[model samples]
Target chain A: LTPLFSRYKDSYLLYSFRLIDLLRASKSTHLTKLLSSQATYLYHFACLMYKDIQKYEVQQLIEWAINASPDMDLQQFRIEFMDKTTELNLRSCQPKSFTYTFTTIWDTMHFLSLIIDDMVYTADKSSLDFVMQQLKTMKVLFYNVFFILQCAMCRDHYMNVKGFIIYHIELIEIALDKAKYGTDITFVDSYQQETAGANNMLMKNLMAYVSMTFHNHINDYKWIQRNKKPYERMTWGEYKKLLNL
Target chain B: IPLTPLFSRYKDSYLLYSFRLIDLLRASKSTHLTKLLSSQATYLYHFACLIQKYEVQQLIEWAINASPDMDLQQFRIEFMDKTTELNLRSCQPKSFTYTFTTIWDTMHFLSLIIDDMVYTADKSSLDFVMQQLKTMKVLFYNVFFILQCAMCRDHYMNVKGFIIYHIELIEIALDKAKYTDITFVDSYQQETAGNMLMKNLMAYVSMTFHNHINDYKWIQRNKYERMTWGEYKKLLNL
Candidate 1:
């Protein structure tokens, strides 16, 4: 593995994948969907950093999350998540960016992905106090990420993807509130659907921007134009049509 | 819509208005105005491309005029050379790099023009706006020149010095320009755009030098020294 793997390895645990399991185990469908979709975005962005990501690794994570048990030991969950994130980081190497601005922004997002993923997995099923314990810390971390992205957006106007991520975080905050305080999660599901729809729309916009802006070059857009063999995701034609191009 | 009719009927008149839009776009950094400027720049370029007007070419030339001292083509050639030396090969740098550099160039050009107009005293002197762009331009070329230096591995300290000097000068300039500047809006756009560009540029240069430092075989094998973005930012007092 390249030395790059070590840079991000222990810094951000695969808490995201484990959080997906935790989210699913609770039968918190909305939170599950929202967090998973966010992970999907992170995965897509990771594809940009490295040309080829193994399809099966992601498939394994998805399958694991869906099949996770509600009564699983919390410590083991944390252990497995760290293992998975470490494995994924092992696959990443020298990432290239088309411009300095993008390099800076992408680097920020790459780290933010791990941090946010960690944020999602902060609680155990055994204790509400544990979840409450990390609330302020999580909020502080989330806001710092928001501020960083806000600064990045000001640098490059086309990076409204940052804005979309911020919006997603806001929705997650609402969903988490529902999860903690309310007896009924009907509102969480409602917000989940809204978040999912918006996530799709936001991804479409991101793909469209990539197509419009970088399609001419062998950058991330060029990779997206290739066969969707890895992630089994969107095609360039769909990206073009997002903006009616 | 307002400018479309003038595209064909009076291309010169269309260009006149297009330059005005470009001017506003360059001078202003607000989100709403940027969107408007980008749309208009796209429309103007679209017409220029379709009509074979070379109006878009003219706009590009205008952008290039922002940095009178530096030759972009030469700078690019140097970029290719340095990346080649470092073996930091990509598919190609020119095609990829132009994506952002072009926009930065155009912004510099427009902002300079705005400054020249906004801060000029009649036949006497240029004011803060022009001075601001001038300072940024100098910082840019200083960075470019630093990249041209040999033994970048040994000169890492020198690169840090360049950044410190660059940042200090700007900090002083902004500090002094605060109260004397006419309106909050006048300088805000240029400062934000210019400052962000500088930040990104510094980060880019830092990475370049870091690669240079790490290219030393002894350091790599022994893990004697390396750099991280966090450390680089700290060294620059970012």
Candidate 2:
């Protein structure tokens, strides 16, 4: 019920539309299917935007997802969702291209939405099949951007953007999972594998970039998240006002 | 009995005086006196050559024991001129074996004598001091012969070889003082002096050999088993 544009503005405008295009090309029929097929992209997109989302917003979203679906085990959903998102943020800080960053964020968001939709449809017997169908449609859009980002950007570019985006995604994922699982599902098997994969990719890209580009600039690409709010969020309205477009 | 007659007779040549003194000591069946005079003469000749080659400061330091009251002013003048001569002579690449050996021996002898004097002064009366000095002299002579045997190789090799060869003798000297029969003073004084002398000797040997190894290229290569002194010098510059 929150303003759709306000909630999805940065995500949709910044990265999600691009993902839709990629997912559409692959002919994904449903969001759940699309995410399962292209979870890496979904995982990355959510991770990138982790820091952008408000704390209350995240708590609300997890609570909604939990209440909306009874069949979706809150603990499993939280663990997988949180772990994947956190890793993506870590990847974003690593040296990667802007396109890679955009795609990874889009893909991760799609994955989270799909998980939520899956929980909602499975738990709430009263919801129509149409809701599941709409969620599937949204997921395809997300995958489309992810594929484009992954395919278009060079490995080095992907890693740089991925480094920054992953850390933000990770925070959201952890917060949700911790809330649901009471912090006990920290070392879930799927979470471990996904994190390891993402970290490996990050390390590989980082080392490759160092070997190819200026070695000193490698640190610049590294993801850093401070407790402080991002500058973009503080003056977002003013920034938009200035654009006056 | 007449010293003037002896001087006048030996005015033409000091060699005759030396020989006459040797004969008199031998006739008196004082083998020790005869040997001492002969050794003294040899040492003096070596000392003169050393003075000619080395700076006066070095010579004075080397001969500090021989003439404890040697004029410091004379030593300074001799050292400055001798340093200049050595610098000039070094350019010509002459064999400096005899000169180096003389300096080494003089310094070693002087240091030992100084150490003995210090020990005697600190521990015993004048009579005891004289006896200690005599004992140290005998010990020095024995060590010197051992060092000579070990160090008789090419001049370059002798720099390090001589020091190493006398390690045992140095130990013996210290041990002798420690175990000496004269026990008027406690064992502490003798032990302290012995330990100090050993430590001082080790320091001296390390410093002297290092300088010797650095100064001459041939010595660096042949004696000390090191790179050419020139190469070592360049490394230091870098």
Candidate 3:
């Protein structure tokens, strides 16, 4: 831990609560030092989230980041977390000891805008595919947060968490819109994208029921156990006629 | 053949037959019942508004409390401020039977109904939610049938405008239902937030669909050749 940050790591008001103060404390000039501050910021974030640590401040900070964010800035704000944990890492200093897996609710909702931003911002056709893979990963994390807890948030936090999801879903088509027509267009074929990957906000109209019924109708198993018979027990025509296989 | 002639001559004289014109006549004593229906629909709309605002307030508090690092009470309060600005800004373009308040009510009410059903798992709240839906379902038809009487004065026209606005509400409700269902609706049959929210949203949508059909039926029953959303808009130059 950075010497100054370690001093107040336990200070809930300063380190865990106040974002502006924490940023002001990180007076590092070099890129490496700047990265160090990012690590502490994440460390602070992880410390707050790992246990679903019930600090009201932690909850409020997350809420502020989510609800207060403007439409344009949300995507750009997401990528800074990605650079170090992802491509922008140094191989030195035995970083393998730390757990770098993304599983928390914070990871799922907080960084979505950044991923979507990168999707629309990139020039490569492959980058959007890569972005989709990242989204597929996050979508898994999204379900994790949903299943692992419920009413997990307090009255309003639960609602805001839902609002967070709605907002995250809100980001999907926005990026697609930018790519398809916005001036900063990318070369991706959105047509080929999978509905399962993201952007299936069609559930509102109860449209999912239609597809679920359809998926259930697919009969991999043609007959009940009582109706089944060995090939030798019955002629092919009899079996076909009885079971309608 | 003599009975057929008698039926044609005296059919209009019976009290039961005279009751059918009760809605159409201002001086008719039987026209009183449907007025109660109008009152109830307006009551349901306002109750929904109450719920919507309650939910929004709770969410704002959650946002404030959510941050362990910073006190976002001030920032979150900005939403109420911004909401006020938007509310005031959107005020001018009016429908006499206006439902613009529905937009505000949605965010406010969405959370509590969801919270009560999911968090506490209370059956009565669910009943209330379902009951609220049912009231509107019955109310729209009563109101429509009542308004068919020309004796009701221009109040019926104001209500015609209101029905159009309420129809607009169906779209808004569906919009939230879609997004809310994405995360909350039960995939299976758990008493999940997703499930509960989905049920109520579907209820709202289902009732609104009934309302649409009622509008269509009222059009035929009233024998108004020109009355419809299209013709209403044309009347108002909308």
Best by TM-score: 1
Those runs of model 2 whose alpha carbons end farther than 4 Å from true positions after fitting are A1-155, A161-163, A176-245, B1-238
Q: Which of the CAPRI classes, incorrect, acceptable, medium or high, describes model 2?
A: incorrect
Q: What digit string (tens of lDDT, one per residue) describes model 3 on residues B1-238? A: 1234322222222211112222122222343543443344334333332244444343333333333333333433443354354442221111222232332222213222332333333434443443444344333324333223454323222222223222222222333333342234421122121113332333232233223333334323432232233332233222
The estimated TM-scores of all candidates read 0.23, 0.17, 0.21
For all predictions in the order shown, the interface RMSD in Å is 19.8, 34.7, 20.3
Using DockQ, rank the candidates from best to worst.
Answer: 1, 3, 2
Q: For model 1, how does the per-residue alpha-carbon lDDT over A173-198 read when each residue is reduced to its tens digit?
A: 43344455543223221222332332
Could you give me the TM-score of model 2 versus the true structure?
A: 0.17
Scored against the true structure, residue B109 in model 3 reaches a CA lDDT of: 33
For A180-226, candidate 2 gives per-residue lDDT tens digits of 33332222222223223311111211211211222212222222111
Give RMSD (Å) of candidate 3 vs. truth. 27.4
User: What fraction of the native alpha-carbon contacts across the interface, defined at 8 angstroms, is recovered by model 2?
Assistant: 0.00
Give all candidates' CA lDDT scores: 0.37, 0.33, 0.30
lDDT of 2 at B94: 23
Comparison by TM-score, 1 against 3, better one: 1
Query: A73, model 3: CA deviation in Å?
Result: 44
Between candidates 1 and 3, name the one with more favorable lDDT.
1
Indicate the docking level reached by candidate 3.
incorrect
